[PDB]
Ligand binder design. Sequence first.
Ligand SMILES: *[C@@H]1O[C@H](CO)[C@@H](O[C@@H]2O[C@H](CO)[C@@H](O[C@@H]3O[C@H](CO)[C@@H](O)[C@H](O[C@H]4O[C@H](CO)[C@@H](O)[C@H](O)[C@@H]4O)[C@@H]3O)[C@H](O)[C@H]2NC(C)=O)[C@H](O)[C@H]1NC(C)=O
Ligand SMILES: *[C@@H]1O[C@H](CO)[C@@H](O[C@@H]2O[C@H](CO)[C@@H](O[C@@H]3O[C@H](CO[C@H]4O[C@H](CO)[C@@H](O)[C@H](O)[C@@H]4O)[C@@H](O)[C@H](O)[C@@H]3O)[C@H](O)[C@H]2NC(C)=O)[C@H](O)[C@H]1NC(C)=O
Ligand SMILES: *[C@@H]1O[C@H](CO)[C@@H](O[C@@H]2O[C@H](CO)[C@@H](O[C@@H]3O[C@H](CO)[C@@H](O)[C@H](O)[C@@H]3O)[C@H](O)[C@H]2NC(C)=O)[C@H](O)[C@H]1NC(C)=O
Ligand SMILES: *[C@@H]1O[C@H](CO)[C@@H](O[C@@H]2O[C@H](CO)[C@@H](O)[C@H](O)[C@H]2NC(C)=O)[C@H](O)[C@H]1NC(C)=O
Ligand SMILES: *[C@@H]1O[C@H](CO)[C@@H](O[C@@H]2O[C@H](CO)[C@@H](O)[C@H](O)[C@H]2NC(C)=O)[C@H](O)[C@H]1NC(C)=O
Ligand SMILES: *[C@@H]1O[C@H](CO)[C@@H](O[C@@H]2O[C@H](CO)[C@@H](O)[C@H](O)[C@H]2NC(C)=O)[C@H](O)[C@H]1NC(C)=O
Ligand SMILES: *[C@@H]1O[C@H](CO)[C@@H](O[C@@H]2O[C@H](CO)[C@@H](O)[C@H](O)[C@H]2NC(C)=O)[C@H](O)[C@H]1NC(C)=O
Ligand SMILES: *[C@@H]1O[C@H](CO)[C@@H](O[C@@H]2O[C@H](CO)[C@@H](O)[C@H](O)[C@H]2NC(C)=O)[C@H](O)[C@H]1NC(C)=O
Ligand SMILES: *[C@@H]1O[C@H](CO)[C@@H](O[C@@H]2O[C@H](CO)[C@@H](O)[C@H](O)[C@H]2NC(C)=O)[C@H](O)[C@H]1NC(C)=O
Ligand SMILES: *[C@@H]1O[C@H](CO)[C@@H](O[C@@H]2O[C@H](CO)[C@@H](O)[C@H](O)[C@H]2NC(C)=O)[C@H](O)[C@H]1NC(C)=O
Ligand SMILES: *[C@@H]1O[C@H](CO)[C@@H](O[C@@H]2O[C@H](CO)[C@@H](O)[C@H](O)[C@H]2NC(C)=O)[C@H](O)[C@H]1NC(C)=O
Ligand SMILES: *[C@@H]1O[C@H](CO)[C@@H](O[C@@H]2O[C@H](CO)[C@@H](O)[C@H](O)[C@H]2NC(C)=O)[C@H](O)[C@H]1NC(C)=O
Ligand SMILES: *[C@@H]1O[C@H](CO)[C@@H](O[C@@H]2O[C@H](CO)[C@@H](O)[C@H](O)[C@H]2NC(C)=O)[C@H](O)[C@H]1NC(C)=O
Ligand SMILES: *[C@@H]1O[C@H](CO)[C@@H](O)[C@H](O)[C@H]1NC(C)=O
Ligand SMILES: *[C@@H]1O[C@H](CO)[C@@H](O)[C@H](O)[C@H]1NC(C)=O
Ligand SMILES: *[C@@H]1O[C@H](CO)[C@@H](O)[C@H](O)[C@H]1NC(C)=O
Ligand SMILES: *[C@@H]1O[C@H](CO)[C@@H](O)[C@H](O)[C@H]1NC(C)=O
Ligand SMILES: *[C@@H]1O[C@H](CO)[C@@H](O)[C@H](O)[C@H]1NC(C)=O
Ligand SMILES: *[C@@H]1O[C@H](CO)[C@@H](O)[C@H](O)[C@H]1NC(C)=O
Ligand SMILES: *[C@@H]1O[C@H](CO)[C@@H](O)[C@H](O)[C@H]1NC(C)=O
Ligand SMILES: *[C@@H]1O[C@H](CO)[C@@H](O)[C@H](O)[C@H]1NC(C)=O
Ligand SMILES: *[C@@H]1O[C@H](CO)[C@@H](O)[C@H](O)[C@H]1NC(C)=O
Lengths: 100, 125, 450, 47, 122, 122
Amino acid sequence: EIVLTQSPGTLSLSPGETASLSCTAASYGHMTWYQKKPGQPPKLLIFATSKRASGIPDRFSGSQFGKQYTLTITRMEPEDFARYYCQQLEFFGQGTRLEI
Amino acid sequence: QVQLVQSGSGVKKPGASVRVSCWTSEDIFERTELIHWVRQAPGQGLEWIGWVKTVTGAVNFGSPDFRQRVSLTRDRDLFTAHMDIRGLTQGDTATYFCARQKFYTGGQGWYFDLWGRGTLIVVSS
Amino acid sequence: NLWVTVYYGVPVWKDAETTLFCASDAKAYETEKHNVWATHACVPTDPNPQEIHLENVTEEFNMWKNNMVEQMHTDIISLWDQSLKPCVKLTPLCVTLQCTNVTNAITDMRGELKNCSFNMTTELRDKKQKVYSLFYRLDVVQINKEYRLINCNTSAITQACPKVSFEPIPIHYCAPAGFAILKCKDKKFNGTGPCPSVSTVQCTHGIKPVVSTQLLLNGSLAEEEVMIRSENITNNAKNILVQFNTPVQINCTRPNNNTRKSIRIGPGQAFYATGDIIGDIRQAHCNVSKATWNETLGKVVKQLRKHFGNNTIIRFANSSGGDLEVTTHSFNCGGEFFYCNTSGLFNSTWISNNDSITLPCRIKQIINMWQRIGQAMYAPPIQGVIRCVSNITGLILTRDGGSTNSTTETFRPGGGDMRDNWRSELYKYKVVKIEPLGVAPTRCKRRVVG
Amino acid sequence: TLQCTNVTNAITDMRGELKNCSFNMTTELRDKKQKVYSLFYRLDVVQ
Amino acid sequence: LGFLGAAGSTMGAASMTLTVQARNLLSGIVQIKQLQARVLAVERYLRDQQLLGIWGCSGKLICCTNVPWNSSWSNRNLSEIWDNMTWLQWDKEISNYTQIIYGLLEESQNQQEKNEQDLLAL
Amino acid sequence: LGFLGAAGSTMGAASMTLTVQARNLLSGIVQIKQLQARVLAVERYLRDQQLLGIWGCSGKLICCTNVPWNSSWSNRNLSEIWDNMTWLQWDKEISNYTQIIYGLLEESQNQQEKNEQDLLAL
Ligand SMILES: *[C@@H]1O[C@H](CO)[C@@H](O[C@@H]2O[C@H](CO)[C@@H](O[C@@H]3O[C@H](CO)[C@@H](O)[C@H](O[C@H]4O[C@H](CO)[C@@H](O)[C@H](O)[C@@H]4O)[C@@H]3O)[C@H](O)[C@H]2NC(C)=O)[C@H](O)[C@H]1NC(C)=O
Ligand SMILES: *[C@@H]1O[C@H](CO)[C@@H](O[C@@H]2O[C@H](CO)[C@@H](O[C@@H]3O[C@H](CO[C@H]4O[C@H](CO)[C@@H](O)[C@H](O)[C@@H]4O)[C@@H](O)[C@H](O)[C@@H]3O)[C@H](O)[C@H]2NC(C)=O)[C@H](O)[C@H]1NC(C)=O
Ligand SMILES: *[C@@H]1O[C@H](CO)[C@@H](O[C@@H]2O[C@H](CO)[C@@H](O[C@@H]3O[C@H](CO)[C@@H](O)[C@H](O)[C@@H]3O)[C@H](O)[C@H]2NC(C)=O)[C@H](O)[C@H]1NC(C)=O
Ligand SMILES: *[C@@H]1O[C@H](CO)[C@@H](O[C@@H]2O[C@H](CO)[C@@H](O)[C@H](O)[C@H]2NC(C)=O)[C@H](O)[C@H]1NC(C)=O
Ligand SMILES: *[C@@H]1O[C@H](CO)[C@@H](O[C@@H]2O[C@H](CO)[C@@H](O)[C@H](O)[C@H]2NC(C)=O)[C@H](O)[C@H]1NC(C)=O
Ligand SMILES: *[C@@H]1O[C@H](CO)[C@@H](O[C@@H]2O[C@H](CO)[C@@H](O)[C@H](O)[C@H]2NC(C)=O)[C@H](O)[C@H]1NC(C)=O
Ligand SMILES: *[C@@H]1O[C@H](CO)[C@@H](O[C@@H]2O[C@H](CO)[C@@H](O)[C@H](O)[C@H]2NC(C)=O)[C@H](O)[C@H]1NC(C)=O
Ligand SMILES: *[C@@H]1O[C@H](CO)[C@@H](O[C@@H]2O[C@H](CO)[C@@H](O)[C@H](O)[C@H]2NC(C)=O)[C@H](O)[C@H]1NC(C)=O
Ligand SMILES: *[C@@H]1O[C@H](CO)[C@@H](O[C@@H]2O[C@H](CO)[C@@H](O)[C@H](O)[C@H]2NC(C)=O)[C@H](O)[C@H]1NC(C)=O
Ligand SMILES: *[C@@H]1O[C@H](CO)[C@@H](O[C@@H]2O[C@H](CO)[C@@H](O)[C@H](O)[C@H]2NC(C)=O)[C@H](O)[C@H]1NC(C)=O
Ligand SMILES: *[C@@H]1O[C@H](CO)[C@@H](O[C@@H]2O[C@H](CO)[C@@H](O)[C@H](O)[C@H]2NC(C)=O)[C@H](O)[C@H]1NC(C)=O
Ligand SMILES: *[C@@H]1O[C@H](CO)[C@@H](O[C@@H]2O[C@H](CO)[C@@H](O)[C@H](O)[C@H]2NC(C)=O)[C@H](O)[C@H]1NC(C)=O
Ligand SMILES: *[C@@H]1O[C@H](CO)[C@@H](O[C@@H]2O[C@H](CO)[C@@H](O)[C@H](O)[C@H]2NC(C)=O)[C@H](O)[C@H]1NC(C)=O
Ligand SMILES: *[C@@H]1O[C@H](CO)[C@@H](O)[C@H](O)[C@H]1NC(C)=O
Ligand SMILES: *[C@@H]1O[C@H](CO)[C@@H](O)[C@H](O)[C@H]1NC(C)=O
Ligand SMILES: *[C@@H]1O[C@H](CO)[C@@H](O)[C@H](O)[C@H]1NC(C)=O
Ligand SMILES: *[C@@H]1O[C@H](CO)[C@@H](O)[C@H](O)[C@H]1NC(C)=O
Ligand SMILES: *[C@@H]1O[C@H](CO)[C@@H](O)[C@H](O)[C@H]1NC(C)=O
Ligand SMILES: *[C@@H]1O[C@H](CO)[C@@H](O)[C@H](O)[C@H]1NC(C)=O
Ligand SMILES: *[C@@H]1O[C@H](CO)[C@@H](O)[C@H](O)[C@H]1NC(C)=O
Ligand SMILES: *[C@@H]1O[C@H](CO)[C@@H](O)[C@H](O)[C@H]1NC(C)=O
Ligand SMILES: *[C@@H]1O[C@H](CO)[C@@H](O)[C@H](O)[C@H]1NC(C)=O
């Protein structure tokens, strides 16, 4: 059993529709999300509590039930096309990528 | 989005040791409970290495493969941190990052609010 | 029809923080008038038994949010600092030292002691003197014959006052009027969540300001069986309080009739330093009963399996590194500060399905309390005989992180944050405020005659 | 006692506003002294 | 039942101990942060007396008004409240009704009765 | 009117706000020179309450005596005082003999009333 896994994985997206990414984990707990672009350090998007991270321009949101958390991104804006990762304490997922 | 000042990059021979370090202003450093290190290998997801406590210097590593080859230190009067890696192998080529957490309440999960630009270590012939 | 009525004195309370009153044993003060914890004036201990069992009352507790810890911590630091203000101010002491290792010693070549000399000031501006005396290796660094004190670039090194005892004195905390302290009576309580049975007490009892690192010494003993408590169990940043149900006894000693020299370094400015040592010089150490320790760990292991499963392996290991204060067991015995090698206690693995352990120790005279930056205290030497006996009541442990290919988990000594010690005694108590105003319906009309 | 002259080899704006002065200052050790140098404004010093 | 022993009893039964609660440091009476604590206890005590004075209930543990009870505040029976509940539960039950009730007691009873009584006295 | 709105208004109208004034820190209730200030507020409150207790006026906003008003100290119509004056003005007219008035409240009413009540009681 892998402690933290992500889905759907890399997908094509169309701007104007709202994105949805999701991941699951062993046991239960708070979960958080980061955004990463090539050549750059990652940045925090959502606090592990699901509260929006400071400095984020109100395009990101999410919630959880059971062992699963879902992240959504407003209107699939191209500015946010990036690698995305889940984190649960010590573990990181394999990540996903936004394409078009 | 405050950046941590990161040390430079370079290339090492197998078996060589290397030091990686980062610096901040005193009003950034004092607020930090833990300084964490992570590794980003090409083609891989992000890997946790370990952390050092800013107050006591206590260290908690991830895989034992790091524990035997990695030592973490901190210096509160210089507002810095250092990572000492020994026994480098070709499999250790990766970008390494300095990152920090200022959350003092449990049950809130881990956070990495601050990041350095990171540095590249290349191990080769 | 019903009407509003008012009831003054209603027995309702709400969670609240308020400053608590310091209380202690006046007789302890009489035995030592300058004791730092006893203080010159305080509220009496109020030993009187609890009147109230609060039948049919339950409520939520959370020891991790218990602000009594912060007040205890603040007061302990404040008393310590205040007690040092009268002290001699040894700052002029930092001069170039010129020296070599101790020679013509009987010995136990240990490099722990050096025989050093320097140009020190005197009562007169015009005169200088050579002090000599001995130093511990831990207190000095090389500039190779030239040396400096290890904390000489800090704001000050000052002598502990020669007539102040640091022996822990019980401190009780009492509610202000209109407030009360509630105590959870549930056996083997988590320290968190709903408590099945509570009671009311005017003050806390039995709490002592005992400073230690890896092993809490002389604390309360778990009521029935070893308790494992933590803020969480998945977050490896958090410490675990082991809470033994039985004590593990330890003897600690220090050799050997070390003499003391009194030096004036200015008008009336007494400076104390280590003089010659009579007879053999041995490394300081402690004995822990091997059998007692082993039975004790077995009990801890049984409890850990409750959180990790019965198909697990529990491994213990020594410290991962960091400051001397976290990597070793530190304690104050007889006024001397010891740092001991505890690795002999943790070299074991536990798998589901007259002897003793001797622990070597080291001594330094310069102490930076509570990891404070820029300040240091110089302890004057204790004149030659240390004998100390203690009760180990529990450990502060951490768990190694990282993924596994197995059910094996590894635990190490950790923490070093003194607030975790205070919490191990204060978890039983909660502070609330009493709110008299209340209203309820009756049939009365408040008839009025005018 | 400070021993000094005007700032020299400066790009400048002879303004007498800045002086380049040196002195023997104490150190962390009673036995050692150091040369500090650094600059002073004219308003803060007298001959 | 002693200090707060009444908390384990019904609201009706608890009324027997109101004096005991008044004695047990509700008064603010003592047997430089310690000085501030003493001052605070006094301020809290006097405030509550003022509120009773505003209601015209001063000097009494139990006081009535002509302000009617709102059955919608609790949706519970008279005997249910007095026999099947504790004061701790009750406080939570009507806890958002303090602002209105407190205002009504002053406006509907105390200032009005005093004005009407003055007119009789004239 | 509201707090401080009331002082300016005719002495009669002001009576509607007596509780309002009591609530708005007149009572001295507090929400190291700052500590001294808190203590003094308490002393001011208790002193005035003691006067009311002496007069038998405690617990009341409006309290009467059997001592006649000294009309020579005010020289105005009853309705003139209540409708055409403020309390700020009124205080100046009767300020000089105020020591006498306070003494009369004790001597002419309370010392004698308590003695007579005791005689009836025994
Ligand atoms: C855990 O608890 C144990 C027991 O309570 C505790 O050990 C005790 O420590 C105290 C203080 O070190 C010991 O008391 C000493 O007893 C000797 C007996 O002759 C006295 O001479 C000592 O007096 C010294 O201090 C005086 C202060 O003015 C000086 O004037 C005098 O000259 C001495 O310097 C002192 O009273 C006590 O005997 C031990 N008990 C045992 C069983 O050894 C232990 O330290 C506690 N552990 C921790 C971590 O606190
Ligand atoms: C260490 O910290 C962890 C958090 O970082 C703690 O994890 C929490 O543990 C509790 C208890 O097991 C979990 O509660 C479960 O929640 C699920 C579903 O959630 C329901 O409620 C939400 C409210 O918004 C609702 O939206 C959902 O639809 C559900 O209605 C229940 O099914 C379970 O029965 C149980 O209640 C927490 O979920 C879990 N984390 C979070 C974020 O909830 C962990 O316990 C801590 N460890 C300790 C204290 O030792
Ligand atoms: C106060 O004085 C102490 C003692 O001199 C200072 O600590 C010393 O700081 C230096 C510089 O960081 C350390 O040097 C290091 O030595 C290792 C040796 O292998 C070398 O690899 C490093 O590159 C570096 O040169 C020195 O070891 C250290 N001494 C001790 C005993 O830890 C301290 O920094 C001073 N505080 C100040 C100036 O604020
Ligand atoms: C430290 O060094 C001093 C100085 O050498 C030692 O004291 C000397 O001992 C010799 C022999 O008895 C005397 O002749 C000297 O006069 C002593 N010097 C002074 C200043 O008293 C001292 O014993 C040494 N300490 C040790 C070896 O622990
Ligand atoms: C005090 O003793 C130490 C040894 O315990 C001396 O340092 C040693 O000096 C020799 C050469 O003479 C070296 O080969 C050793 O490696 C040194 N040891 C260490 C730990 O560095 C020391 O010089 C003596 N006294 C002083 C003032 O240094
Ligand atoms: C540590 O030393 C103490 C003595 O200082 C030991 O306690 C004594 O043990 C003897 C054994 O025959 C008893 O007769 C004494 O009555 C004990 N003294 C007491 C209990 O105060 C203690 O057992 C030693 N600890 C260890 C682990 O050996
Ligand atoms: C801890 O145990 C050791 C070993 O038993 C004690 O050291 C012995 O002390 C006796 C004292 O008469 C000596 O005769 C032995 O030779 C010592 N054994 C050694 C040096 O290996 C030690 O004193 C005990 N420590 C205490 C009680 O604090
Ligand atoms: C430690 O020092 C004390 C003195 O401070 C020594 O006590 C001496 O004991 C002998 C025993 O017969 C007496 O004759 C001496 O008069 C004592 N000294 C004093 C100053 O009175 C004690 O013996 C010393 N211990 C060691 C190991 O030398
Ligand atoms: C923990 O215990 C081990 C022994 O089981 C200590 O031994 C160290 O082992 C490493 C192996 O590479 C050596 O390089 C070290 O030199 C050994 N000791 C020291 C002091 O360096 C280890 O030190 C112990 N950790 C502590 C005491 O913190
Ligand atoms: C703490 O105690 C352990 C155990 O005694 C020490 O480990 C020793 O390390 C040296 C390193 O050269 C080895 O040669 C010994 O054989 C080890 N002893 C063992 C394994 O029993 C460790 O060095 C001590 N740590 C410190 C800081 O002194
Ligand atoms: C370690 O714990 C034991 C057990 O609680 C302590 O011994 C008890 O001390 C009390 C003191 O009033 C006695 O009444 C008990 O009868 C003792 N229990 C025994 C002898 O089994 C011991 O003193 C504690 N050690 C320290 C240093 O506090
Ligand atoms: C706490 O609860 C118990 C019940 O569990 C109360 O016991 C009551 O005792 C009276 C005595 O006449 C009986 O009439 C009641 O029926 C009992 N209650 C129940 C539920 O059986 C006890 O009085 C309660 N504590 C307080 C302070 O009231
Ligand atoms: C402040 O001045 C205004 C304006 O004069 C006062 O308004 C009075 O309103 C009542 C309403 O019935 C009228 O009968 C009055 O004639 C108005 N003024 C006067 C002077 O009579 C207002 O009441 C004044 N506020 C006070 C006195 O507190
Ligand atoms: C100490 O002072 C003397 C002069 O009084 C000087 O000769 C000596 O060199 C100084 N220190 C040492 C180690 O010599
Ligand atoms: C501690 O909390 C856990 C989770 O609620 C519970 O299962 C356990 O029984 C508690 N322990 C005690 C002593 O109440
Ligand atoms: C501790 O107990 C275990 C058995 O549970 C035993 O195998 C081990 O040798 C003991 N350790 C000792 C006696 O030091
Ligand atoms: C330091 O003292 C010496 C004493 O001779 C003096 O010559 C020197 O000028 C002083 N400072 C400097 C910078 O020269
Ligand atoms: C009772 O609640 C209703 C809610 O609409 C309110 O209108 C009514 O005035 C309230 N009664 C009292 C006495 O407050
Ligand atoms: C009181 O009990 C009676 C029982 O018939 C019920 O009809 C009434 O609604 C109750 N009053 C309440 C719950 O306020
Ligand atoms: C007070 O308001 C909160 C708001 O959600 C409500 O949940 C609570 O039940 C209310 N309490 C009362 C006594 O009405
Ligand atoms: C009150 O008004 C009447 C009007 O005739 C006047 O005679 C009387 O003296 C007045 N009383 C006073 C001013 O006290
Ligand atoms: C009050 O006394 C002062 C000072 O003697 C005097 O000037 C003033 O006229 C008096 N006022 C009254 C109302 O009697």
